[PDB]
Amino acid sequence: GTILLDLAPEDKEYQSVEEEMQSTIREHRDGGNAGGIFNRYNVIRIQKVVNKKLRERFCHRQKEVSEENHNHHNERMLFHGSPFINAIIHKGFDERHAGMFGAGIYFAENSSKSNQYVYGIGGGTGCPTHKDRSCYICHRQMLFCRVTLGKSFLQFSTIKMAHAPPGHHSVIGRYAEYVIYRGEQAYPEYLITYQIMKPEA
Ligand SMILES: COc1cc(Cl)c(C#N)cc1C(=O)NCCN1CCC(C(=O)c2ccc(F)cc2)CC1
Ligand code: NA
């Protein structure tokens, strides 16, 4: 079973994660259409996900990856947001449920990019209660994950890939989207619960 460790706001970790989330908010080409309009998040809570099976699968996989990437995991903390966060923290990422760079699992360096996906592709129909993509009431969830990138393949054009190219373990596509093709190359380290904040007048 999954265990959620509740981080205290006075925790360096907590602060470190919130800092990464707040500082990577950016203006998106859609003018806020998908994720809403905001400049800052109100972080309700940050929790650490502990799940033995997921950890085991993740360790097993980075082992194979480093073994192919000159003994380097090439790990990176990245954000992921989607309507399946809950299934993810219990069963892990699943590429069978998978896109601009193929049937992979996507991660963003910008928290605001992930927020655009919290309610679905293009933000879907927004939050359940108000059908509002820029809802300032409803609590959103986002993950800040350890992603095993290994040897990244650089893709500069949309392509429907099924897996990373031979000898590769991830695809950095072009900002840049980080895409892996195996659920085990990502561990949902932090579960962030938050609200976007309405900018002041
Ligand atoms: C191209 O789509 C994206 C791009 C970005 Cl940049 C981000 C972010 N940040 C998230 C998505 C996304 O959620 N796509 C939908 C397809 N995903 C497939 C894998 C799914 C998954 O891992 C899962 C695991 C267990 C389940 F029970 C259900 C789904 C999540 C949904
Ligand atoms: Na995804």
Side-chain angles (χ1 to χ4, degrees):
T2 300
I3 293 166
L4 295 185
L5 266 37
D6 295 63
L7 270 40
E10 23 288 339
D11 200 295
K12 178 208 183 302
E13 238 184 314
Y14 181 120
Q15 283 165 39
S16 167
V17 177
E18 168 154 20
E19 186 53 49
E20 182 67 40
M21 180 187 199
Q22 305 279 21
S23 63
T24 60
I25 296 182
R26 69 180 171 75
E27 279 298 77
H28 294 273
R29 203 176 307 118
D30 75 352
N33 179 60
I37 284 179
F38 59 94
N39 301 309
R40 183 140 198 294
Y41 307 104
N42 172 48
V43 173
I44 309 309
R45 67 175 167 285
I46 300 186
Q47 304 169 288
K48 211 164 183 177
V49 177
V50 186
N51 176 300
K52 177 174 169 274
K53 300 285 181 290
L54 295 189
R55 278 182 170 181
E56 183 290 303
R57 289 196 275 259
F58 182 82
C59 293
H60 188 271
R61 180 57 178 170
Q62 40 161 34
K63 204 185 303 284
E64 309 175 323
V65 167
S66 74
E67 232 152 46
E68 272 177 53
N69 186 47
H70 307 290
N71 316 118
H72 289 301
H73 296 160
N74 177 25
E75 183 174 311
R76 292 199 47 177
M77 295 304 295
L78 297 167
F79 296 106
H80 169 90
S82 62
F84 318 78
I85 299 315
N86 185 241
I88 298 174
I89 66 180
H90 294 86
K91 299 179 293 184
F93 287 99
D94 190 340
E95 64 292 339
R96 290 173 287 177
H97 287 272
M100 198 178 294
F101 294 109
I105 295 146
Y106 298 61
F107 298 82
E109 295 177 288
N110 299 125
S111 64
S112 57
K113 180 64 169 177
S114 294
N115 173 69
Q116 295 189 101
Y117 288 90
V118 170
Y119 286 123
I121 307 303
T125 56
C127 71
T129 311
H130 319 85
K131 264 56 171 53
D132 178 0
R133 288 197 286 282
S134 185
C135 187
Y136 297 116
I137 302 169
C138 292
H139 292 16
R140 311 176 174 219
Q141 289 196 314
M142 174 183 310
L143 294 174
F144 184 41
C145 328
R146 285 176 189 275
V147 183
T148 293
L149 295 181
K151 180 180 286 296
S152 301
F153 179 80
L154 290 311
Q155 181 60 40
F156 290 106
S157 53
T158 207
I159 186 179
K160 12 66 190 295
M161 291 192 249
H163 315 292
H168 292 68
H169 318 94
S170 54
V171 162
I172 302 192
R174 285 188 173 281
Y175 291 73
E177 300 208 299
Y178 293 81
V179 188
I180 50 171
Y181 297 89
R182 275 158 177 263
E184 327 77 74
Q185 285 173 217
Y187 181 93
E189 263 282 291
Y190 304 98
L191 171 62
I192 306 160
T193 296
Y194 67 107
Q195 295 166 305
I196 49 176
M197 295 180 83
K198 194 187 179 191
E200 209 39 46

